[PDB]
C-alpha cells in the first residue's frame, strides 16, 4: 500500500519498511523511519541509507524541527535517483505531515493543494489538529 507521491518518493507504514522484496524492486535506496521506538528494519543488509525522526504522533510532538534533515534527505535521494520511503507505524500522520511539509517547499504548492494531493493518492492521512497547525507556521514562515 505504499503510496507513491512521487517519482522518488513513497509513503507508508510499518509493514511496508519490511518488504525488501518489493523495496529493492521500486528501486528504494532510503529509508525515513518517523518513529521512535521501531527498528530500522533491514539495516544489517547493508542496503539502504536511513534517518530516523524520534517522533510520536502526540498533540505535543514538534516535527518542525526534523522538516529540514528530512528535505535535505529526499533532496539527496532526488539528486541520487533513487527511491525513498518515508513511513510512520501506519501512514497516517507523522510521516505525511513531513511529506505534506515538502511537498509546499520543494515542490510549488501551498498546505491545502499538498494535503490535497497527498489525501488523493493516500486517503487514510490524517494529521492531527497539532500538526496541522505547524504546517501552517510553517507556510507563513515560508511566505514570511
Given at each position: 500500500?505504499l503510496?507513491?507521491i ?8 510499518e ?26 528494519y ?10 530516523r525522526?524520534?517522533?510520536?504522533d ?11 534533515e ?22 497516517v ?10 511537498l509546499m ?5 501551498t ?16 494529521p ?17
Open positions: 500500500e503510496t507513491p512521487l517519482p522518488f518518493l513513497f509513503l507508508g507504514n509493514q511496508d519498511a519490511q518488504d525488501l522484496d518489493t523495496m529493492q524492486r521500486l528501486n528504494i535506496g532510503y529509508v525515513i523511519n518517523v518513529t521512535t521506538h521501531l527498528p530500522l533491514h539495516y544489517e543488509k547493508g542496503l539502504f541509507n536511513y534517518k525522526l524520534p517522533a510520536t502526540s498533540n505535543k510532538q514538534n516535527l518542525r524541527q526534523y522538516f529540514e528530512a528535505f535535505e534527505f529526499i533532496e539527496e535521494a532526488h539528486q541520487c535517483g533513487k527511491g525513498l520511503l518515508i513511513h510512520c507505524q501506519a501512514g500522520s507523522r510521516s505525511a505531515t513531513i511529506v505534506i511539509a515538502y517547499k520543494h515542490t510549488r504548492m498546505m491545502t493543494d499538498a494535503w490535497k494531493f497527498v489525501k488523493g493518492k493516500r486517503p487514510i492521512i490524517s492531527n489538529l497539532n500538526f496541522m497547525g505547524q504546517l501552517l507556521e510553517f507556510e507563513e514562515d515560508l511566505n514570511n
